[PDB]
Amino acid sequence: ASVATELRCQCLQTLQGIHPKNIQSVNVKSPGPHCAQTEVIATLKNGRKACLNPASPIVKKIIEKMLNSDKSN
Amino acid sequence: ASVATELRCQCLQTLQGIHPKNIQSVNVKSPGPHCAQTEVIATLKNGRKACLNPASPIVKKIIEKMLNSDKSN
């Protein structure tokens, strides 16, 4: 399907963060044999995506927020 | 690249959860015009992936855990 020494830092770059309303999904790829630096990702609600920095406070909150986004309903 | 009314519940099914050591990434796709039910995902450290249920307590902890996985180093 897709696997062959082809793993690049899914988030070569990163953004300080963004409102949790502009995001839609949250892909957090931990560091491994391809990237020793965590890589957070947010799929905007417009089919767009934006990597964030897990070292910043706004990013750590971007995730903690999505988590609640799914609290019963 | 990849976008055309082709969005299916990334997690048609779900698993009660799993240890945070067997996972590697955490893809949380919120519900939208394709799935009205949140969909959590965990990429094992063996290139494998497993969807979890965001309605269970172990799943909500699977995420809260990864978040810490990236706390300075």
Swiss-Prot record, chains A, B:
Disulfide bonds join C9-C35, C11-C51. This is Growth-regulated alpha protein. The lineage of its organism: Eukaryota, Metazoa, Chordata, Craniata, Vertebrata. The chain holds residues 35 to 107 of 107 of the full protein.
